[PDB]
Write an enzyme that holds these catalytic residues in place. Structure first.
Site, PDB file in Angstrom:
ATOM      1  N   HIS A   1      -4.038  -5.992   1.432  1.00  0.00           N
ATOM      2  CA  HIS A   1      -5.375  -6.170   1.059  1.00  0.00           C
ATOM      3  C   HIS A   1      -5.594  -6.034  -0.193  1.00  0.00           C
ATOM      4  CE1 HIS A   1      -7.320  -2.298   1.153  1.00  0.00           C
ATOM      5  NE2 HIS A   1      -6.913  -2.122   2.479  1.00  0.00           N
TER       6      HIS A   1
ATOM      7  N   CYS B   1      -7.625   3.279  -0.308  1.00  0.00           N
ATOM      8  CA  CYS B   1      -6.668   2.431   0.218  1.00  0.00           C
ATOM      9  C   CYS B   1      -5.305   2.757  -0.503  1.00  0.00           C
ATOM     10  CB  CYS B   1      -6.917   0.794   0.246  1.00  0.00           C
ATOM     11  SG  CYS B   1      -8.361   0.706   1.204  1.00  0.00           S
TER      12      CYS B   1
ATOM     13  N   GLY C   1     -11.890   2.611  -2.468  1.00  0.00           N
ATOM     14  CA  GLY C   1     -10.593   2.826  -3.532  1.00  0.00           C
ATOM     15  C   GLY C   1      -9.619   3.597  -3.073  1.00  0.00           C
TER      16      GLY C   1
HETATM   17  O1  LIG Z   1     -11.664   4.214   3.615  1.00  0.00           O
HETATM   18  C1  LIG Z   1     -12.011   3.285   2.921  1.00  0.00           C
HETATM   19  C2  LIG Z   1     -11.256   2.145   2.387  1.00  0.00           C
HETATM   20  C3  LIG Z   1     -12.255   0.887   2.172  1.00  0.00           C
HETATM   21  C4  LIG Z   1     -12.390   0.095   3.389  1.00  0.00           C
HETATM   22  O2  LIG Z   1     -12.084   0.471   4.529  1.00  0.00           O
HETATM   23  N1  LIG Z   1     -11.946  -1.275   2.808  1.00  0.00           N
HETATM   24  C5  LIG Z   1     -12.030  -1.838   1.669  1.00  0.00           C
HETATM   25  C6  LIG Z   1     -10.942  -2.261   1.007  1.00  0.00           C
HETATM   26  C7  LIG Z   1     -11.038  -3.053  -0.014  1.00  0.00           C
HETATM   27  C8  LIG Z   1     -12.056  -3.392  -0.447  1.00  0.00           C
HETATM   28  N2  LIG Z   1     -12.312  -4.377  -1.483  1.00  0.00           N
HETATM   29  C9  LIG Z   1     -11.309  -5.331  -1.902  1.00  0.00           C
HETATM   30  C10 LIG Z   1     -12.032  -6.453  -3.011  1.00  0.00           C
HETATM   31  C11 LIG Z   1     -12.939  -5.326  -3.558  1.00  0.00           C
HETATM   32  C12 LIG Z   1     -13.514  -4.451  -2.388  1.00  0.00           C
HETATM   33  O3  LIG Z   1     -14.365  -3.647  -2.587  1.00  0.00           O
HETATM   34  C13 LIG Z   1     -13.481  -3.250   0.470  1.00  0.00           C
HETATM   35  C14 LIG Z   1     -13.202  -2.520   1.513  1.00  0.00           C
HETATM   36  C15 LIG Z   1     -11.643  -2.087   4.324  1.00  0.00           C
HETATM   37  C16 LIG Z   1     -12.530  -2.595   5.295  1.00  0.00           C
HETATM   38  C17 LIG Z   1     -12.165  -3.242   6.338  1.00  0.00           C
HETATM   39  C18 LIG Z   1     -10.987  -3.760   6.497  1.00  0.00           C
HETATM   40  C19 LIG Z   1      -9.929  -3.352   5.473  1.00  0.00           C
HETATM   41 CL1  LIG Z   1      -8.245  -3.887   6.041  1.00  0.00          CL
HETATM   42  C20 LIG Z   1     -10.364  -2.608   4.674  1.00  0.00           C
HETATM   43  C21 LIG Z   1     -13.592   1.733   2.235  1.00  0.00           C
HETATM   44  C22 LIG Z   1     -14.892   1.266   1.853  1.00  0.00           C
HETATM   45  C23 LIG Z   1     -16.088   2.092   2.085  1.00  0.00           C
HETATM   46  C24 LIG Z   1     -15.854   3.336   2.496  1.00  0.00           C
HETATM   47  C25 LIG Z   1     -14.448   3.792   2.863  1.00  0.00           C
HETATM   48  C26 LIG Z   1     -13.343   2.953   2.656  1.00  0.00           C
END
Ligand SMILES: O=C1C[C@@H](C(=O)N(c2ccc(N3CCCC3=O)cc2)c2cccc(Cl)c2)c2ccccc21
Ligand SMILES: O=C1C[C@@H](C(=O)N(c2ccc(N3CCCC3=O)cc2)c2cccc(Cl)c2)c2ccccc21
Ligand code: NA
Ligand code: NA
Ligand code: NA
Lengths: 305, 305
Positions: free
Chosen positions: B41, B145, B143
């Site tokens: 992702h 991930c 951030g």
């Molecule tokens: O532990 C985490 C990691 C993150 C998370 O869960 N993401 C996440 C990943 C990337 C983005 N990106 C990409 C582009 C700009 C951006 O913000 C956002 C969220 C996620 C959400 C749903 C499905 C998947 Cl596979 C991933 C998160 C957000 C808030 C609080 C805790 C957590």
């Protein structure tokens, strides 16, 4: 989200750990620049631990009686000195892995990470508090002496603790890196009283703020209190009295959450008087006091090193 | 003595963490030999996360669209490929800090250390368990991930987890290092059921053994049970059923303490049925299940890496 008891990443400290042997006694040391720091009881036999005369014991030792090994490398000792309860061995090689560092004497109620080591090799890392009675509740076996406690700010390691002893009560005592014990302890195998301990109120309140930030909110109530009123409750339950300096330090968490410090005190007073009723807060069925306000903000904001 | 939730020393892993950026999106990767591993992702924008077509999104990217930075070391990407939910970026430089390592897929109930990272920089380390429902209860912000979970055995790092996602329930999901999710999860911003979790019975029993070794013995009773009888109680309390394989794994602790495994089961049954009556075991007011039998023995015997 989530809230864990998180330790600092240990690699900068791992690179400083060595094994120090004097005769048949072995423990850990800390190699910074061209000095190795370790507990002075490295120079004792089991017979000596009951009542060591450290000055007389050390007079029997020369540089060549201290063997210092850093992994498989032997370091050459070119000087030794005792400072309070630590020995300082001067070595002929500066540690190439020395981080930026300072030695600090921490206050009761402050937190740090411990890197538990045996034979100069790291075994594990965990976070704990300095109790109000200057003990720590760690996890240490024979051979762990010279394991250190630290905090990291960006690239700088602040060493605050060197492990020396387990008391017959199973809690732990040690020194700052200038060799001065925290608390009334002496490095001798004798029963030694530790204060009455107390719970670190400002840390409990920080953790309740953490709980709210994470959506555990069931303990918020419709009450407020005053510092005096709360401090009467603190006394009864062997909590530290809260001061305006503590209120000031909690101002960031108060602003972040919208919950006035004295309102959160009122929540805490109700938990002290009524207990938790078989509920949990951040996975705990007790009130937790090993997070500082700085810790809560750092974990809740993702600060790196 | 003492017993703490101890993490592995993180230095061998810290030297593998890098920042990966693709367009405007940044997360952590793991640099081993001449490959960087990260969640796929990284190639998404916020609008893509609701329903990403990863194959189509990745077809829009060339090598030069992935920026990889290792501190201020900028790495040149010379190949990319998707494997399940992970990207593998081939770089033209082998990481000089690469440890001895393996990739493993852990079982539910096993423990590991997490090194939480942001922008390729370590922020903290903590120990946790893989839940029976293949979630972890971590501490992770946006951030984080690409932060990894691991176990260390002497000089060898076994990577077991790469963080991908927080579920709307606030628990965490991720993959092995071949990109296969633990559990039923998919990498998409959708509500996703985790299904019923259970308490890891063999770990609770391990921790009771730990408590006995440390002198906390108040919960030992005059009773025994059978596997069948205990498993009826386990079922009622949403505990995993105990099997003879679990009994076999508990043999070392049973021998150390002299308490037969089914005798300890009977202590556990009485705690389940009666609660702790406002007492504590190893500083906890709940039954703890994030220590494996191997963890208890390792901590109680001082093993190093
Ligand atoms: O532990 C985490 C990691 C993150 C998370 O869960 N993401 C996440 C990943 C990337 C983005 N990106 C990409 C582009 C700009 C951006 O913000 C956002 C969220 C996620 C959400 C749903 C499905 C998947 Cl596979 C991933 C998160 C957000 C808030 C609080 C805790 C957590
Ligand atoms: O956390 C620790 C450290 C260690 C400890 O407490 N010692 C200790 C130090 C050296 C030896 N030595 C030296 C010579 C051969 C030997 O075993 C023994 C014990 C200690 C005891 C009292 C006074 C002081 Cl200052 C130190 C210990 C033993 C058992 C369990 C836990 C712990
Ligand atoms: Na402590
Ligand atoms: Na002390
Ligand atoms: Na998962």
């Amino acid at each position: 989200s989530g809230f864990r008891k998180m330790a600092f990443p240990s690699g900068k400290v791992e690179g400083c750990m060595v094994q120090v042997t004097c005769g048949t006694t072995t423990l850990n040391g800390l190699w910074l620049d061209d000095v190795v720091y370790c507990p002075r009881h490295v120079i004792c036999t089991s017979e000596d631990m009951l009542n060591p005369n450290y000055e007389d014991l050390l007079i029997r030792k020369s540089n060549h009686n201290f063997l210092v090994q850093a992994g498989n490398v032997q370091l050459r000792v070119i000087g030794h000195s005792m400072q309070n309860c630590v020995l300082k061995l001067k070595v002929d090689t500066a540690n190439p892995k020395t981080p930026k560092y300072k030695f600090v004497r921490i206050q009761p109620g402050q937190t740090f990470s411990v890197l538990a080591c045996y034979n100069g090799s790291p075994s594990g890392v965990y976070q704990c508090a300095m109790r109000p009675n200057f003990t720590i509740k760690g996890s240490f076996l024979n051979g762990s002496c010279g394991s250190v406690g630290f905090n990291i700010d960006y690239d700088c390691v602040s060493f605050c603790y060197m492990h020396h002893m387990e008391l017959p009560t199973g809690v732990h005592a040690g020194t700052d890196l200038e060799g001065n014990f925290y608390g009334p302890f002496v490095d001798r195998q004798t029963a030694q009283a530790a204060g009455t301990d107390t719970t670190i109120t400002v840390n409990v309140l920080a953790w309740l703020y953490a709980a709210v930030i994470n959506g555990d909110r069931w303990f918020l109530n419709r009450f407020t209190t005053t510092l005096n009123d709360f401090n009467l409750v603190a006394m009864k339950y062997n909590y530290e009295p809260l001061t305006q300096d503590h209120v000031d330090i909690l101002g960031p968490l108060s602003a972040q959450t919208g919950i006035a410090v004295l309102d959160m005190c009122a929540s805490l007073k109700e938990l002290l008087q009524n207990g938790m009723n078989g509920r949990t807060i951040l996975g705990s069925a007790l009130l937790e006091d090993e997070f500082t306000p700085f810790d809560v903000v750092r974990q809740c904001s993702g600060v790196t090193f």
